Enzyme design. Structure first.
Site, PDB file in Angstrom:
ATOM      1  N   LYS C  43      11.766  31.222  70.101  1.00  0.00           N
ATOM      2  CA  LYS C  43      11.016  30.746  71.353  1.00  0.00           C
ATOM      3  C   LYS C  43      11.279  31.738  72.677  1.00  0.00           C
ATOM      4  CE  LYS C  43      12.716  26.967  73.482  1.00  0.00           C
ATOM      5  NZ  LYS C  43      13.076  25.566  73.795  1.00  0.00           N
ATOM      6  N   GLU C  69      18.116  21.294  81.194  1.00  0.00           N
ATOM      7  CA  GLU C  69      18.658  22.306  80.552  1.00  0.00           C
ATOM      8  C   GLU C  69      20.002  21.768  79.990  1.00  0.00           C
ATOM      9  OE1 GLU C  69      16.836  24.951  80.668  1.00  0.00           O
ATOM     10  OE2 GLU C  69      18.072  26.467  79.982  1.00  0.00           O
ATOM     11  N   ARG C  70      20.205  22.296  78.652  1.00  0.00           N
ATOM     12  CA  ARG C  70      21.525  22.419  78.062  1.00  0.00           C
ATOM     13  C   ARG C  70      22.035  23.801  78.735  1.00  0.00           C
ATOM     14  NH1 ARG C  70      19.607  21.233  73.910  1.00  0.00           N
ATOM     15  NH2 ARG C  70      20.227  19.757  72.417  1.00  0.00           N
TER      16      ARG C  70
END
Lengths: 252, 126, 355, 48, 265, 119, 116, 116, 124
Positions: C43, C69-70
């Protein structure tokens, strides 16, 4: 935990369980008469668990390179991964280890669903040696899940073979509780497995196979085991070393 | 009396649904399953009842007994309708002395089972 | 959002340089593209490629927004970007990074999308460019907007979502568009709750997408890179009247070719290719070459693989796949079409593979 | 066996570890059963 | 239309579509195996019956019916049994031997005292000459084959893959052979029962060919049928999937309201 | 075209065919009398000008046509590149069974075997 | 195993696998009958059904319902009888002989009493 | 029966049993189709499908939707008609004939029309 | 005009859908024959976007549709013929278009008058 993280050391932390933490947070909120949402959880029930698990990390060299690893526990209800909390948490974590009573009553313990278990980190965190003899393992067990219903009289030798690996392989991943294996003890068994040295053996003997193989390897090949444990990789020689020692034990 | 001849009926009727579910496989039946299928079908049918027509115990008892001890088992399913009333009619007419004992005593003594046994076979032969 | 005056009267394709994309699921200029797929599908590599290709081919910057977000992945991306040199601490970057992680509270996570979008909207109005705005993940933006609503004590809508859900998306999406000055095109990661395309969230989102790009585990496993699924990734800007006849007809027949192949996969694994008519076995031996020509080596993946990457200008993608459909490269083996530039890179590579 | 089969005993004594890979070993195994039928009702079962 | 139901409902269809798609793929390979036995039997039909072509042998009737014991294959047995009754109109009193039970079951119900012998354990693997000789032998044995004025084998001929065809073919007993119109052309040397054998052995051979063709016509049918089952359960899955999401969704809302109302008071 | 086994079919134009007929060996060819003959358990051969290729066979039927086509049918069947010890050990068990309806089938084996020995 | 011994744990696990298999096959039994089964399977099912019944038992309390006298079974007798059943040392006995009885004594007793 | 009388009562019930059976089988026919049904079952379905189509009736008011001028059947007319069908006195008639027509007379008509 | 030429066309196709979805069985030249229609008919409804047809132009197509003048024309030449046929009518049977455009009705007068313009183009 972070104490260790911040101090160049490494901890790991098990949350048993997060379901019940969420339940608790709920009680506080409703009573405080904070407004409820889905299943009567407050809006910030996500924010709760995100805050928690985002704290887990591998810090960079400048930070002492310490680390904190997280094993949150989440309790599904009748297997519902869409359930509100499991949803939140699944979308926070880097993957899941997935258990099923079905597999459990089959006697497959740990009762790990392989098809459903993923580790987004994956490759990067594996004893190179274990990753060496197992790139095939997810491959084989994938195709074994797809030809499974064929276990009920007239199958061609190709999809026959696939059922031959699968049963043995699955058997090889059963593991009584409290008895975890050293890496240098895993790689031999997974080797003999993947490269077809168990196809000859019957499926019930795969039990005593492991015990006797490893104790033999200890006495008569403690040197290869030592190299695996120390080098962490497999020489082209080491592959013939193991191969030879297996074919010797399998013949015997 | 009802208890005595209704021994196990409710459990049997369960086993019957059991075999009738396995019947949906439409795979050949043996003499054991076909056996219990024939009886369960007739027992089912024997319990059907018109509204507004409650029956005396002594009318109920011989019906149940005829079904349970399998005197109904060689009779067409659509005809079990006519069996019921034709039977009772005959029992009143002839063996009324039994029907009146059942009622008065509420308990089938060993000889009363005999008279009833005979009485049923008799009638089934037509 | 740019008034009804400042509107683009015509839809228009944005060139990306990726064969799969331009040929099958071509991007809207100032449009919105739903990007699908988790990990194991490259990705971020694909994203960086577009940032590079939008900068290199067109000449516009990109803004990557991390919504929900992680943090781990924020640290990965930032490093991987430096490593790929789309970020250049010493020289020049092509991308601005605006992160808003999970740990941040619901207010923060709702606004970050706007935070980033604002930055991107400057490069379209001040500097009149064709900018890329990335949103990962547009779903968690939704999610966040729901939490904000609950805390504000408003009555949840259907399926517990914010009553404001429609307009909230609108306010966001309607700033992402073409003006006379330039354009902001958006690639937005889309998660699908419980795998339910009828859930309010995706429902209301699809309402703005013009093209989906679906990467797939199946496609990567077959060695094809990018791992774009040629069949699923559909563009609502693939109409004859808007891509032209020749482009359209080609793409149409290509999908049709791959369709017949897909369904034949099962009779081949039973009775062999001895079970096909003249016409049927012809396209099948050919569809392999097409499914192999869809794969393309990337410039950004050059540090990872070392193989010189090719940007394929859309006319190549047309004429290349055109000449194949008629049967002009049948004597040419299959490993030529795999991992190459245009049709002339098949020609030169097959001469290696020959003598 | 018979004449009809004459050459199926001359082909099955002449059947009996080579060519018998599937083909003939199976050509050798027949799972048929016959039963005579009388006035609806049958007669009895027997292997062909 | 509860959620509990719709879920498990939708499961057992997925589980069916699995089996049906297995079926299709399994028959396809089985048709490969029975393709070679339908070229090698229809070829032994050449050398055999060619002798007849010359003798132009033109025909207590013996009808032999061919199918299998297996169900789950559409109208294989159903519509063969009909052509057998279509032909069993013009001779109400013709003896039948049946191969495979499903046909026997079919005829046993309609011409219950026509059949004198029956065979089973057939349509599992591809038929071999060994069987075809042993049945012919037994047709000679108990059935008194040669002593019949006429013999015809009934079988399902495979026209394509999607469709088959109920078919008939004539067996020509001895006698007829001797009275062959063009039999004089063949300088065949009367040394003891010689036409008898040829009959006794054309009954086996013809039967085989029929059985080979019937089985390979049935396999084709099973494949095609099972294929479509997969298409339908495929489309059903799609429907129930949609219904599932509806129910889920509402389950969430009706469950939620209960709380909201509970909460206002 | 015309020479078949029930599992494997073989030949198609021929210049000389040798067969083991009911009464002694015979040879069909170019133009021959239309004939039908039981084929005894023995060797056979094909021709294409000067091409020698001999098979063994179980037995069956031969039928020469008026339209001139020869059709030969057998069940089981290269010459020595097909069938010594495989024959020997079997010949032992064969003769043994003869001394035993059951032993009658063994009589068929003795003649078929003894023939094969000569090859 | 640490608490009940290995043998106990193994019987208990196998019994469970059995019934788990039998449950899994109930699809194929409905649809394609009992006919379309592997031979090991056919036996597993045979054994699973026998086992299902041997798990029932007349309670004393529930005499009003079964009219059958209450049977109490000793834990060692349980494990021994299920072990036997599992190794096939009882494959001949009909299903009904395991239903609503105490120990394997009662399985044999009933088996003969019915065959009489 | 006290109101409509034993016959109209029974022609009703018997019609319903038929339809209810067809309904019970909706699943098997959906997957296995007709060929897997028994003989008695098979008949019931063809009969039910006839009864079902026969229950349809052209309405005068709805003429601008059928095209066929609407029909009005009578009570005595309806009961007889259905009774005949339930005695299989019409089994030999294509299912389509029963669709969208008046009383039993209209069925024999349309069937002659189509049989040409 | 259209209602005359489309007699019941509705439930024809609507019960044609449940039939063709019971084929994927046997060769039945009763409903097999009626299939050649429903396919050519749906192939006939196919309309490219931004293509507004006039009534007089639709009537002859439904004509040949329910009268089956096009069954002998290839399935991939159905929509192609649609263009060929209007080219044929526009400078020949011009009044047929004109009168259906004036009245909107159909006499038995215009019926046979068009039943000559249809099988004509089936040959040419």
């Amino acid at each position: 935990g972070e104490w260790f993280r911040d101090n160049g050391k490494h901890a790991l932390i098990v949350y048993d369980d997060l379901s019940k933490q969420a339940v608790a947070y709920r009680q506080l909120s409703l009573l405080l008469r904070r407004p409820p949402g889905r299943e009567a959880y407050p809006g910030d029930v996500f924010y709760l668990h995100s805050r928690l698990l985002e704290r887990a990390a591998k810090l960079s060299e400048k930070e002492g390179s310490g680390s904190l690893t997280a094993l949150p526990v989440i309790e599904t209800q009748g297997g519902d991964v869409s359930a509100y909390i499991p949803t939140n948490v699944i979308s926070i974590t880097d993957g899941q280890i997935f258990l099923e009573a079905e597999l459990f009553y089959k006697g497959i313990r740990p009762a790990i669903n392989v098809g459903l278990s993923v580790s987004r980190v994956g490759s990067a965190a594996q004893v190179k040696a274990l990753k060496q003899v197992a790139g095939s393992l997810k491959l084989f067990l994938a195709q074994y899940r797809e030809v499974a219903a064929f276990a009920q009289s007239d199958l061609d030798a190709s999809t026959k073979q696939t059922l031959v690996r699968g049963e043995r392989l699955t058997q090889l991943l059963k593991q009584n509780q409290y008895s975890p294996l050293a890496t240098e003890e895993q790689v031999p068994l997974i080797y003999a497995g993947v490269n077809g040295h168990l196809d000859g053996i019957e499926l019930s003997r795969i039990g005593e196979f492991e015990s006797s193989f490893l104790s033999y390897l200890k006495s008569n090949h403690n040197e290869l085991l030592t190299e695996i444990r120390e080098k962490g990789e497999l020489s082209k020689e080491l592959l013939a070393s193991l191969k030879s020692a297996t074919e010797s034990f399998v013949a015997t | 009396a009802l208890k005595q001849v209704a021994g196990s009926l409710k459990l049997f009727l369960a086993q019957y649904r059991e075999v009738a579910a396995f019947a949906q496989f439409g795979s050949d039946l043996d003499a054991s399953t076909k056996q219990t299928l024939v009886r369960g079908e007739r027992l089912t049918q024997l319990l059907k009842q018109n509204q507004y027509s409650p029956l005396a115990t002594e009318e109920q008892v011989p019906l149940i007994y005829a079904g349970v001890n399998g005197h109904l088992d060689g009779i067409e399913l659509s005809r079990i309708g006519e069996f019921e009333s034709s039977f009772l009619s005959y029992l009143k007419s002839n063996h009324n002395e039994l029907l009146t004992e059942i009622r008065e005593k509420g308990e089938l003594s060993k000889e009363l089972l005999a008279s009833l046994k005979s009485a049923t076979e008799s009638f089934v032969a037509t | 959002p740019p008034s009804f005056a400042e509107q683009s009267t015509s839809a228009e394709i944005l060139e990306t340089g990726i064969k799969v994309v331009d040929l099958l699921a071509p991007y809207a200029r100032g449009g919105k593209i739903g990007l699908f797929g988790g990990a194991g599908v490259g990705k971020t590599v694909f994203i960086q490629e577009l940032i590079n290709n939008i900068a290199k081919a067109h000449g516009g910057f990109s803004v990557f927004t991390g919504v929900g977000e992680r943090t781990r992945e924020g640290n990965d991306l930032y490093r991987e970007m430096k490593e790929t040199g789309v970020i250049n601490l010493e020289g020049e970057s092509k991308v601005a990074l605006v992160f808003g992680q999970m740990n941040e509270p619901p207010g923060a996570r709702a606004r970050v999308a706007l935070t980033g979008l604002t930055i991107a909207e400057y490069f379209r109005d001040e500097e009149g460019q064709d900018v890329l705005l990335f949103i990962d993940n547009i779903f968690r933006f939704t999610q966040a907007g729901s939490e904000v609503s609950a805390l504000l004590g408003r009555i949840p809508s259907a399926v517990g979502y914010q009553p404001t859900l429609a307009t909230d998306m609108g306010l966001l999406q309607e700033r992402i568009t073409t003006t006379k000055k330039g354009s902001v095109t958006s690639v937005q990661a889309v998660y699908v709750p419980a795998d339910d395309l009828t859930d309010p969230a995706p429902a209301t989102t699809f309402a703005h997408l013009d093209a989906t790009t679906v990467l797939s585990r199946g496609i990567s496993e077959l060695g094809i890179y990018p791992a774009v699924d040629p069949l699923d990734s559909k563009s609502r800007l693939l109409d004859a009247a808007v891509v032209g006849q020749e482009h359209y007809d080609v793409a149409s027949k290509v999908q049709e070719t791959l369709q017949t192949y897909k369904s034949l996969q099962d009779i081949i694994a039973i009775l062999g290719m001895d079970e096909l008519s003249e016409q049927d076995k012809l396209t099948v031996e050919r569809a392999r070459k097409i499914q192999r020509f869809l794969s393309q080596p990337f410039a950004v993946a050059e540090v990872f693989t070392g193989i010189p990457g090719k940007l394929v200008r859309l006319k190549d993608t047309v004429a290349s796949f055109k000449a194949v459909l008629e049967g002009k490269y049948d004597n040419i083996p299959e490993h030529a079409f795999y991992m190459v530039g245009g049709i002339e890179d098949v020609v030169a590579k097959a001469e290696k593979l020959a003598a | 066996m018979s004449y009809a089969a004459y050459l199926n005993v001359a082909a099955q004594a002449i059947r009996s570890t080579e060519l018998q890979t599937a083909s003939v070993t199976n050509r050798s195994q027949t799972d048929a059963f016959y039963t005579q039928y009388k006035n609806a009702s049958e007669p009895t079962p027997m292997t062909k | 239309a509860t959620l509990k139901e719709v879920e498990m409902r939708l499961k057992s269809i997925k589980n069916i579509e699995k089996i049906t798609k297995t079926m299709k793929i399994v028959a396809s390979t089985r048709l490969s195996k029975a393709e070679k036995a339908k070229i090698s039997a229809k070829k032994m039909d050449e050398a055999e019956q060619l002798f007849y072509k010359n003798a132009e042998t033109k025909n207590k009737e013996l009808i032999v019916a061919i199918t299998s014991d297996k169900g789950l294959c559409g109208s294989i047995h159903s519509q063969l049994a009909k052509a057998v009754r279509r032909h069993l109109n013009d001779q109400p009193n013709a003896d039948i031997v049946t191969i495979g039970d499903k046909i026997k079951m079919q005829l046993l119900r309609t011409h219950p005292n026509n059949i004198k012998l029956s065979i089973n354990g057939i349509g599992k693997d591809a038929p071999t000459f060994q069987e075809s000789a042993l049945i012919a032998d037994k047709l000679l044995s108990v059935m008194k084959a040669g002593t019949y004025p006429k013999i015809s084998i009934f079988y399902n001929d495979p026209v394509s893959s999607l469709s088959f065809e109920p078919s008939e073919k004539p067996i020509f007993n001895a006698k007829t052979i001797e009275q062959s119109p063009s039999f004089g052309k063949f300088e065949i040397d009367t040394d003891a029962n010689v036409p008898r054998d040829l009959f006794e052995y054309t009954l086996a051979n013809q039967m085989l060919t029929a059985m080979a063709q019937g089985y390979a016509a049935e396999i084709s049918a099973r494949r095609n049928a099972m294929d479509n089952a997969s298409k339908n359960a495929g489309d059903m899955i799609n429907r129930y999937s949609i219904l599932y999401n509806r129910t889920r969704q509402a389950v969430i809302t009706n469950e939620l309201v209960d709380i909201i109302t509970g909460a206002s008071s | 075209l015309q020479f078949a086994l029930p599992h494997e079919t073989l030949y198609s134009e021929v210049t000389q065919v040798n067969l083991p007929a009911k009464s002694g060996r015979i040879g069909v060819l170019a133009n021959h009398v239309p004939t039908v003959e039981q084929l005894l358990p023995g060797v056979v051969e094909v021709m294409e000008g000067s091409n020698s290729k001999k098979f063994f066979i179980s037995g069956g039927f031969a039928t020469v046509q008026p339209d001139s086509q020869l059709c030969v049918t057998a069940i089981e069947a290269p010459l020595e590149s097909f069938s010594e010890n495989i024959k020997n050990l079997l010949a032992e068990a064969k003769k043994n069974v003869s001394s035993s309806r059951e032993a009658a089938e063994a009589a068929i084996q003795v003649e078929v075997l003894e023939n094969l020995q000569s090859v």
